[PDB]
């Protein structure tokens, strides 16, 4: 029965994080589709362990420790190519492919794994055949990759090209709390349907470049689009976006949001916890809250202290001087399905790079910055699981804790770090 090490953090069905050894039958862990996964057993035992680590300069590596028999949920890209080569004076048509095959393991077991297969036919016999293969491959699957599992210990059996192309995955968090919404209700008595939107946005601006002792943040002047947004939004919360305006020689216009009748914005900043212990913080509940709220929040942050580039794909960069926020950002961004990486600018400053196609466009379409806004996706889109390459390190023996799911379930659940791992069970 594959398992994990003690302390392994698991994401609960309700969005809470829990240490695997503290999990008890009946509890529901988080399913990758956002739905619960009831725990029905708790494997125990000793066994060689393997630490899983992302291969990759501020580290933000995805990782977890498992036992040797733990089934890694992996994906390998499908692949096909035809080439012509001359072998020993004879020209051949060769088709190299990635397909599911077999390999005798050290213990004599037959392990089913993706393999790089090669097939060649003499040119004299013609192409058809090579095509009846390249053709059957391309239409043998509706997917562009293989979805499978391999035991940690068996990962060494993979050929070099397949091993390097094989990756694990972390799923976006589709479950949605309402800590933010439920908060709104507790606020005043009357407020527009777009109250949650407007506040999350303003909080993003605050976290971006706002003072830590007052509902005041700075914004760029040449950005008339962003200004109209602040003003427009403040008003939605009966606030005044006050600033010296064109009578204060400067480029970074300080914007003061007063109660305009101890106000909504700041009451949330403290109530929700965007400022814990005098220092800025990214509330942990964000990650598992309303998706629209998560995006709106990021759009604000991006609008106050970040930039967007499109050279080699749409990408957003947010700069933060605090490590608390930094790691909070990486978590919140990954929860939407964005691909994230961090670097240290002249370590005083921190840059969080985010990419993700439609997932990123769904955030930027909420920004107001002149060079930040990007039109929303051209259509509905699913938030695909993201892959990460990894390194496996064989460890000595230790106690392991596994979790078994129902018989009808997909047999998968998420770790606190969103990594999609396999249920602990026989087979």
């Amino acid at each position: 029965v594959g398992s994990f090490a003690k302390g392994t953090n698991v994401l609960m069905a309700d969005g809470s994080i829990e240490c695997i050894e503290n999990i008890e039958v009946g509890n529901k862990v988080m399913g990758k589709d956002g739905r619960p996964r009831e725990v029905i057993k708790l494997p125990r035992g000793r066994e060689t362990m393997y630490s899983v680590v992302q291969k990759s300069e501020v580290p933000e590596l995805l990782k977890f420790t498992c036992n040797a028999t733990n089934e890694l949920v992996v994906r390998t890209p499908r692949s096909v190519r035809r080439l012509s080569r001359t072998i020993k004076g004879v020209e051949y048509f060769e088709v190299i492919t990635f397909e599911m095959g077999q390999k005798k393991a050290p213990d004599g077991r037959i392990v089913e794994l993706v393999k790089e297969v090669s097939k060649s036919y003499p040119i004299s016999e013609g192409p058809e055949r090579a095509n009846e293969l390249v053709e059957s491959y391309r239409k043998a699957s509706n997917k562009a990759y293989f979805e499978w599992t391999i035991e940690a210990r068996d990962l060494s059996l993979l050929g070099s090209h397949v091993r390097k192309a094989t990756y694990q995955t972390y799923a976006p968090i589709l479950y949605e709390n309402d800590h933010f919404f439920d908060y709104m209700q507790k606020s005043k008595f009357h407020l527009t349907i777009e109250g949650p939107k407007v506040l999350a946005y303003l909080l993003g601006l605050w976290i971006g470049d706002g003072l830590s002792d007052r509902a005041t943040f700075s914004v760029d002047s040449r950005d008339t689009s962003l200004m109209e947004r602040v003003t427009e939004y403040a008003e939605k919360l009966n606030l005044c976006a006050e600033y010296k305006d064109r009578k204060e020689p400067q480029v970074a216009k300080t914007v003061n949001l007063y109660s305009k009748v101890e106000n909504p914005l700041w009451d949330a900043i403290v109530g929700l916890g965007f400022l814990k212990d005098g220092v800025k913080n990214i509330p942990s509940f964000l990650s598992t809250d309303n998706i629209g709220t998560r995006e709106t929040f990021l759009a604000g942050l991006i609008d106050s202290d970040g930039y967007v580039t499109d050279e080699h794909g749409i990408k957003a960069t947010i700069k933060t001087i605090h490590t608390s926020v930094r790691d909070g950002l990486v978590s919140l961004a990954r929860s939407l399905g964005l691909v994230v990486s961090v670097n240290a600018e002249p370590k005083i400053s921190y840059a969080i790079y985010m990419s993700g196609g439609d997932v990123l466009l769904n955030v930027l379409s909420k920004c107001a910055g002149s060079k930040k806004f990007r039109p929303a996706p051209a259509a509905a889109f699913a938030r695909e699981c993201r892959g990460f390459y990894f390194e496996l390190q064989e460890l000595k023996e230790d106690d392991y804790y596994g979790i078994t799911l129902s018989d009808d379930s997909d047999h998968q659940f998420l770790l606190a770090n969103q990594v999609v791992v396999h249920s602990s069970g026989e087979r």
Side-chain angles (χ1 to χ4, degrees):
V1 59
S3 282
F4 313 82
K6 174 177 173 178
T8 288
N9 285 290
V10 180
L11 177 59
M12 300 315 314
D14 68 329
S16 62
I17 291 182
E18 198 137 78
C19 302
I20 195 169
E21 64 267 24
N22 291 160
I23 301 182
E24 329 170 311
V25 182
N27 284 171
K28 300 175 185 56
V29 291
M30 189 65 90
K32 63 178 164 62
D33 65 324
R35 294 176 174 59
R37 293 295 182 295
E38 178 179 346
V39 184
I40 65 174
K41 285 222 189 77
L42 304 180
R44 290 282 183 278
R46 298 270 298 185
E47 179 184 349
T48 297
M49 305 294 269
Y50 280 84
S51 65
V52 191
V53 56
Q54 182 175 15
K55 307 168 89 66
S56 64
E57 299 171 298
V58 182
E60 297 283 32
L61 310 175
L62 288 174
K63 69 176 77 171
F64 66 89
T65 299
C66 65
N67 67 6
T69 183
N70 173 232
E71 291 194 303
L72 297 184
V73 180
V74 298
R75 289 192 188 181
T76 304
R78 286 180 61 79
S79 187
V80 58
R81 73 168 295 207
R82 196 183 77 180
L83 63 157
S84 285
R85 186 192 307 175
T86 292
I87 297 296
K88 309 163 80 179
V90 186
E91 308 191 322
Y92 299 76
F93 273 150
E94 186 186 4
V95 177
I96 292 172
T97 57
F98 271 17
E99 34 182 280
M100 283 293 262
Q102 306 177 307
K103 172 82 165 184
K104 186 194 290 173
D107 65 0
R109 296 184 297 100
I110 293 295
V111 182
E112 160 170 294
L113 41 62
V114 179
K115 299 170 65 180
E116 190 186 66
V117 172
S118 176
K119 301 179 178 177
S120 53
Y121 301 111
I123 306 295
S124 301
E125 300 166 295
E128 292 187 61
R129 188 164 41 182
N131 298 301
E132 298 192 61
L133 187 52
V134 176
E135 196 293 296
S136 70
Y137 188 83
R138 301 186 172 174
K139 90 163 188 302
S141 180
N142 61 302
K143 281 149 52 178
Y145 56 83
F146 291 109
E147 302 189 59
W148 58 300
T149 68
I150 187 172
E151 280 175 34
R153 68 175 183 185
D154 290 341
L155 197 66
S156 61
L157 297 184
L158 295 178
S160 61
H161 289 178
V162 175
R163 171 70 188 85
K164 293 193 177 190
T166 293
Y167 54 102
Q168 274 185 270
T169 69
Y170 68 89
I173 301 174
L174 299 177
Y175 173 61
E176 290 182 291
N177 280 311
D178 297 304
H179 200 64
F180 200 77
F181 182 104
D182 289 354
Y183 185 72
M184 299 294 92
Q185 299 295 300
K186 288 188 52 48
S187 178
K188 324 309 174 186
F189 197 118
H190 53 303
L191 190 56
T192 54
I193 180 67
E194 59 204 65
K197 177 184 62 177
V198 174
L199 187 63
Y201 181 67
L202 299 181
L203 284 169
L205 290 181
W206 189 71
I207 292 298
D209 51 39
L211 296 182
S212 173
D213 75 324
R214 71 193 75 180
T216 302
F217 56 67
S218 45
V219 184
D220 189 297
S221 302
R222 305 103 69 185
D223 217 329
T224 78
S225 292
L226 177 45
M227 252 297 134
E228 284 174 38
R229 164 58 70 73
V230 179
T231 286
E232 184 197 301
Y233 269 34
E235 202 239 64
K236 297 290 181 55
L237 309 176
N238 211 58
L239 299 172
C240 188
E242 185 280 334
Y243 43 72
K244 294 74 175 189
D245 208 306
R246 294 184 169 61
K247 70 155 56 184
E248 173 185 63
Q250 241 302 299
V251 56
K253 290 293 182 62
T254 300
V255 179
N256 292 296
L257 286 59
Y258 299 98
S259 186
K260 174 168 176 292
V261 180
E262 306 181 5
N263 62 304
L265 182 63
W266 179 269
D267 277 339
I269 294 185
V270 179
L272 292 176
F274 289 74
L275 188 62
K276 185 181 70 62
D277 306 5
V279 295
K280 296 180 176 182
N281 172 58
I282 297 289
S284 47
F285 81 88
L286 248 298
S287 294
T288 48
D289 213 56
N290 183 271
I291 287 181
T293 292
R294 300 182 205 167
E295 306 169 318
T296 310
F297 178 69
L298 283 182
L301 185 50
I302 289 165
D303 270 332
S304 59
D305 65 305
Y307 53 89
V308 177
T309 60
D310 33 57
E311 249 187 1
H312 297 282
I314 185 68
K315 170 152 52 191
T317 294
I318 293 166
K319 308 294 296 298
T320 180
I321 315 73
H322 322 303
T323 54
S324 172
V325 172
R326 179 194 69 187
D327 297 310
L329 174 53
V330 180
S331 165
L332 178 58
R334 261 166 197 171
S335 93
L336 285 170
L338 293 156
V339 174
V340 186
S341 65
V342 183
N343 293 123
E345 299 288 59
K347 303 177 177 178
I348 305 179
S349 169
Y350 294 109
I352 288 67
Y353 301 87
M354 310 177 298
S355 64
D358 293 330
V359 164
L360 175 47
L361 291 189
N362 220 56
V363 170
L364 295 165
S365 56
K366 300 176 162 71
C367 298
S370 190
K371 309 299 187 297
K372 312 309 178 53
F373 172 88
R374 286 304 182 293
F381 69 103
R383 294 163 182 279
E384 256 75 44
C385 289
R386 305 292 189 175
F388 63 106
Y389 296 106
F390 53 100
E391 297 185 307
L392 222 63
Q393 179 55 61
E394 168 173 47
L395 304 179
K396 62 195 188 300
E397 286 183 50
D398 262 80
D399 316 309
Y400 64 68
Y401 304 66
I403 268 61
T404 303
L405 301 180
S406 58
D407 274 2
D408 39 51
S409 68
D410 58 352
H411 309 303
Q412 284 167 45
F413 67 103
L414 315 181
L415 293 189
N417 62 16
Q418 283 175 272
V419 175
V420 177
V421 292
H422 202 282
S423 163
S424 302
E426 312 75 53
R427 68 295 169 182

